[PDB]
Amino acid sequence: MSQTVGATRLAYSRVWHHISAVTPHPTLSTIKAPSEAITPPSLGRLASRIATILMGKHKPIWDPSTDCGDYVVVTNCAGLYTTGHKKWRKTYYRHNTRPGSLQAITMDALMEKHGGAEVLRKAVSGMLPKNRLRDKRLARLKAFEGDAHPYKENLVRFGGKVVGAPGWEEAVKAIREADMERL
Partner RNA sequence: GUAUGUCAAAAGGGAAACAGCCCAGAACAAGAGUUAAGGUUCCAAAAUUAUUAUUAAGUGAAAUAAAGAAAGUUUUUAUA
Partner RNA sequence: CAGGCUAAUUUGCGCAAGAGUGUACAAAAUGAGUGCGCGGUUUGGCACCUCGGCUUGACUAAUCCUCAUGGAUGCAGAAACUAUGUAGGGUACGACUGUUCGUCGAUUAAAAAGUUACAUGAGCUGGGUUAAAUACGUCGUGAGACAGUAUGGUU
Partner RNA sequence: GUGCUGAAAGCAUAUAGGCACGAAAUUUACCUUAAGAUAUUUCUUAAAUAUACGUAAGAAAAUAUUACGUUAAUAGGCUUA
Residues at the site binding other proteins, with contacts judged by CB under 8 A: 21-22, 39-40, 76, 78-79, 81, 85, 87-89, 92, 94, 96-99, 105, 110, 112-115, 117-118, 121-122, 125, 138-139, 142, 144-150
Q: Which is nearer to other proteins, 6 or 100 (CB)?
A: 100
Q: Which does residue 57 touch among other proteins, RNA, none (CB within 5 to 8 A, set by kind)?
A: RNA
Q: Which is nearer to RNA, 150 or 166 (CB)?
A: 150
Question: Distance between CA atoms of 63 and 55, rounded to whole angstroms?
Answer: 9
Question: Distance between CA atoms of 29 and 52, rounded to whole angstroms?
Answer: 17
Q: Which is nearer to RNA, 39 or 52 (CB)?
A: 52
Q: How far is the CB of 158 from RNA (least distance, A)?
A: 25
Question: Distance between CA atoms of 12 and 32, rounded to whole angstroms?
Answer: 35
Question: Distance between CA atoms of 61 and 46, rounded to whole angstroms?
Answer: 23
* 148: Cβ contacts below 8 Å, ≥ 6 apart: none
Q: Which does residue 129 touch among RNA, other proteins, none (CB within 5 to 8 A, set by kind)?
A: RNA
Q: Which is nearer to RNA, 73 or 128 (CB)?
A: 128
Q: How far is the CB of 32 from RNA (least distance, A)?
A: 8
Instruction: Report whether 167 contacts 161 (CB < 8 A).
Output: yes
Supply the angle between the helices 43-54 and 115-126 in degrees, to the nearest 10: 60
Interface contacts to RNA, rule CB under 7 A: 28, 44-45, 48-49, 51-52, 55, 57, 64, 83-86, 89-90, 99-100, 126-130
Q: How far is the CB of 152 from RNA (least distance, A)?
A: 22
Q: How far is the CB of 70 from RNA (least distance, A)?
A: 15
Q: Which is nearer to other proteins, 53 or 80 (CB)?
A: 80
Give Cα separations from 152 to 18, 32, 147, 175, 181 (angstroms): 9, 31, 10, 22, 33
- Chain centroid offset of residue 163 CA: 14
Instruction: Identify residue 139 by its one-letter amino acid code.
Output: A
Q: Which does residue 59 touch among other proteins, RNA, none (CB within 5 to 8 A, set by kind)?
A: none
